[PDB]
Paper text:
Highly polymorphic class I molecules encoded by the major histocompatibility complex (MHC) are crucial in the adaptive immune response to viruses and some intracellular bacteria, binding peptides inside the cell and presenting them on the cell surface to CD8 T lymphocytes. In contrast, chicken TAP genes are highly polymorphic, with each haplotype encoding a TAP molecule with a peptide-translocation specificity matching the peptide-binding specificity of the dominantly expressed class I molecule encoded by the BF2 gene, with the BF1 gene expressed poorly or not at all. In this paper, we find that two other haplotypes known to confer resistance to Marek's disease also have low cell surface expression and promiscuous peptide motifs, and examine the structural basis for promiscuous binding in three low expressing molecules. Second, we show that peptide-binding repertoire and level of cell surface expression are inversely correlated in both chickens and humans, indicating that this relationship is a fundamental property of class I molecules.
The dominantly expressed class I molecule BF2*0201 binds VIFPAKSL but not RRALREGY, while the minor class I molecule BF1*0201 binds RRALREGY but not VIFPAKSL. The heavy chain BF2*0201 refolded with β2m and the appropriate peptide migrates as a native monomer, whereas refolded with the inappropriate or no peptide migrates in the same position as heavy chain alone. All of the other B2 peptides have generally smaller hydrophobic amino acids at P2 and somewhat larger hydrophobic amino acids at Pc. Crystal structures with two of these peptides, YPYLGPNTL and VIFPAKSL, show that Pro and Ile at peptide position P2 and Leu at Pc bind shallow hydrophobic pockets, similar to the way in which anchor residues bind pockets B and F in many mammalian class I molecules. This mode of binding is completely different from BF2*2101 that remodels the binding site, despite the fact that BF2*0201 shares Asp24 and Arg9 with BF2*2101. Structures of BF2*0201 and BF2*1401 show promiscuous binding via hydrophobic binding pockets for the anchor residues at peptide position P2 and Pc, with the class I residues at positions 24 and 9 playing supporting roles, and with residues lining the pockets explaining the relative size of anchor residues. The differences in pocket sizes are primarily due to difference in size between Val43(45) and Tyr43(45) for pocket B and between Asp113(116) and Met113(116) for pocket F, which are supported by a network of hydrogen bonds from Thr24 and Gln9 in BF2*1401 and from Asp24 and Arg9 in BF2*0201. In BF2*0201 and BF2*1401, the two Ser residues are replaced by the large residues Asn69(70) and Tyr97(99), creating a constricted groove much more like narrow grooves found in high expressing fastidious molecules such as BF2*0401.
Author numbering:
A (entry chain B): 2 to 97
B (entry chain A): 1 to 275
C (entry chain C): 1 to 8
Amino acid sequence: LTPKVQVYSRFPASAGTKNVLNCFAAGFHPPKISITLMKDGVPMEGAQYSDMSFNDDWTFQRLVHADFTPSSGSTYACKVEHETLKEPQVYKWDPE
Amino acid sequence: ELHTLRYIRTAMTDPGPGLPWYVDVGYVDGELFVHYNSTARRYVPRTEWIAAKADQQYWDGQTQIGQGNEQIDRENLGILQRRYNQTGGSHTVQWMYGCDILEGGPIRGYYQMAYDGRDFTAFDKGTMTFTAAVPEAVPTKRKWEEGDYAEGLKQYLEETCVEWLRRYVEYGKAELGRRERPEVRVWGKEADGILTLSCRAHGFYPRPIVVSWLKDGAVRGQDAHSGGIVPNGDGTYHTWVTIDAQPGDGDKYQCRVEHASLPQPGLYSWEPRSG
Amino acid sequence: VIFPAKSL
């Protein structure tokens, strides 16, 4: 029942372009989850949390998206906290 | 042709901090249209077609039943806890009900329930009885088969659910019938003597897509990894498909993308930079 | 249209 987290961008990532960073977690129970979008270890500003839903096999799913601009050198990651993980898992994002 | 309606409902004990305990999410053809939460206590639109074409009476009407269901499902948390001999902790109740219509006529009528991620009760339209999976589902089985609840649910899934879904499709015929191009980007990475080729489709509509790696014309799904179809904030969809190959064979690999928006499948070869 | 819930 461990959450399967996938970090990706709304549009093909380019330097100095308006894009949305998405963090999606699927297949988790209990539904209580702490997903936060991070920029060099510090949480991102203006993070929107999509409405919680579940698949046919009763496994929960949630999406976290925020408007941003990717800069060269700055690392973008996703911090996920869950009861089954026991330790906070960090998911790194690649622009190219 | 095929049009599906689904009402996802969740009742939680541990939301936990600054989150609603009761959430009711609606779906039309796999797309979010309506939402209800325990903090706002009102049914709110999520799409443009449901916000404009639906009357104010519909919003006040759905909220009346929505507020009523919230108070009924509030006691339902305690009912299960006292039956399972539980003092407290993280416990959740899940609801899944709706209809699938094909060329007007209905083909599916389901009503499913689950407690702690395990199947509790499921309604059978043919026999008009509620199936018990866990031995703690027998008091619920005797309660609902006693009154007119089984008759009312059968009348809903065959008439009320069917008639309203036909209207929802007619309201959003343009937003559901639309097609968007995914915009495919190919990138490769060199690890410990293994080349990892990635194929990404950013924004496509509808949800179904066929993204597979091809080696010398032949499709290879044995070594290819896929993260399924993931949704976006605006309403579009995304997908992630990767493959592990030996370095130097970059020319042999080609990514084929099959979608409703494209008339012919789009081929994408991995042309590197090496600069 | 949502269906009205009943006590378990």
